[PDB]
Design a protein around this nucleic acid. Structure first.
Ligand SMILES: c1ccc([P+](c2ccccc2)(c2ccccc2)c2ccccc2)cc1
Ligand SMILES: c1ccc([P+](c2ccccc2)(c2ccccc2)c2ccccc2)cc1
Ligand code: NA
Ligand code: NA
Ligand SMILES: [Zn+2]
Ligand SMILES: [Zn+2]
Lengths: 275, 275
DNA sequence: ACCCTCCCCTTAGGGGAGGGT
DNA sequence: ACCCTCCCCTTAGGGGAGGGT
């Protein structure tokens, strides 16, 4: 013969009144009784127990309506349910955990960029390999190149990485170019970070890599008048130290801000490998 | 000199029109321009890139408004941001992962119950230990005992386990009782599952355990007329096989359904340990 | 002091409809 | 065919106010 004022309840079970009042209307936890004069809600000591499964359920993060159907069931039943909630919990787990590493990649990459000590001049080094899938730019030249021109490769990388292209790129041959118009892009790629089996690749793509080798590269921020010279310094550089090239030029631009509020920029980075 | 119909966009970047239209009003991704006749939205090929950070951001699961402030920043800045997003991701991780094991406990327990082969009769066995905190029931008897009578211990276990009391319990001495009224509860406890340092325990509690020992226990579903006899069979059992008891009786009830829709039941389980 | 109720806020869009080229 | 807009749905409550014992 003991009843509890709603407050009392909110006190006993740790509950937001608004919360239980909500449950009453939600029609989950209803008062044992309602004084139809004061519309006050008064619960029964027995009731409390109900507030467990909801409470527990809530903790596990199960949407209320499911909680409804959940209450009716008996042990061995609810048990299975619990297991469901388990594969579940255990799934966001590995989903989430995945990105955890993915990010790391993005950062280890992000950083790597800002660390370019010789912003402006040619730098030589030992680089690590770069899994990347690319296609064959059908006549795309440094002039024409778009974004649209990327899309496919884009869609793909998102499907597999979840994370989109950060730094866009393209290869072109190696020549003692006279002018820009002189040059025209070969393949255009995108770096790939999700180690998992990249599947469903329509054969128009090639999944490949930028072999961990000797690199002659240089970086900056784009400027037409710029871009040029830098390729120049580049060509010259090699020519001078008479080294032997081994690939095409990996030009690889990355936007620097993403603000729309203002005139975009991108750190560019052309590179060749050598022996 | 290339523009894209909103659709085109939705096609190029993988986007729900409603989604970008939302971004336009959200005032994140705005059309490059709006034909003030047809109010159509037309974006610039350049724009696309913006759709990266949002897209990426979205993936990581960062609320739009934060995405707003996120766009303005530059590399080394956004980088930190990224790291934030990291501790973050890496936090739901271990939070979540925690329960993952917690559940397992609950289940390994849940199951354990349904497996009681001798529902009705006394069973003897080798049990594992039970970390549990309890208090000293101030005169609570099998008659009086509430829920309210629990609250404190309750609040506590939730703070530490997140998960609430599933199976409620209490100890009482061991005697050749005549009647129920004859008996009166000693401590009442609650089992504890979160292995972590149970802190802030107000000294009115005792954190303890149900020593992995020999047990004489029996189970059922509550029924007043029942409860009694079963304690009886119990007492008798020992007495008969003249064993030597070593603790008090661990009576430990658990509700069987949680349906409010109907008259509650609970599997009870009284037990003593012995040598 | 407690309670009750009504209302208006929070996110990220989706569906659906009418209407217009 | 595409687009545009308006509207009304989704969750779990919170705050806040007025009013009543
Ligand atoms: C003695 C015991 C219980 C009630 P009451 C009730 C409580 C508070 C205010 C008005 C009425 C009640 C409330 C909640 C649970 C059990 C009992 C009560 C009286 C008449 C009809 C229904 C309930 C009355 C007298
Ligand atoms: C040639 C090139 C672009 C435009 P328009 C435009 C497009 C579709 C329908 C009406 C107008 C445009 C739209 C989006 C991006 C760039 C250009 C255009 C015409 C007048 C004023 C503003 C925009 C017109 C002629
Ligand atoms: Na209509
Ligand atoms: Na008012
Ligand atoms: Zn080729
Ligand atoms: Zn004691």
């Amino acid at each position: 013969e003991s009843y509890y004022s709603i407050g009392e309840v909110s006190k006993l079970a740790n509950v937001s009144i608004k919360a239980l009042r909500y449950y009453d209307k939600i029609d989950l936890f209803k008062p044992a009784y309602v004084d139809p004069d004061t519309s006050y809600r008064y619960y029964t000591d027995s009731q409390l127990i109900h507030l467990d499964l909801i409470k527990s359920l809530k903790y596990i993060g199960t949407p209320l309506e499911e909680m409804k159907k959940a209450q009716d069931l008996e042990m061995e039943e609810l048990f299975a349910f619990y297991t469901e909630q388990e594969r579940q919990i255990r799934e966001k787990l590995d989903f989430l955990s995945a990105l955890e590493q993915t990010i790391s990649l993005v950062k280890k990459r992000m950083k790597r960029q800002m660390e370019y000590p010789a912003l402006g001049e040619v730098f030589v080094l030992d680089e690590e390999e770069i899994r990347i899938i690319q296609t064959e730019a059908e006549g795309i030249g440094p002039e024409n190149v778009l974004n649209a021109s990327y899309s496919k490769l884009k869609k793909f990388i998102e499907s597999a990485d979840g994370f989109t292209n950060n730094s866009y790129g393209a290869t072109f041959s190696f020549q003692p170019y006279t002018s820009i118009d002189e040059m025209t892009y070969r393949h255009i790629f995108t770096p790939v970070l999700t180690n998992k089996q990249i599947s469903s690749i329509t054969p128009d793509m090639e999944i490949t890599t930028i072999p961990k080798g000797r690199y002659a590269c240089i970086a900056y921020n784009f400027s037409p008048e710029h871009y040029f010279l830098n390729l120049q310094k580049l060509i010259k550089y090699i020519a001078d130290r008479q080294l032997t090239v081994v690939s095409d030029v990996y030009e690889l631009i990355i936007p620097i801000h993403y603000s729309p509020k203002k005139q975009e920029e991108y750190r560019v980075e052309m590179k060749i490998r050598i022996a």
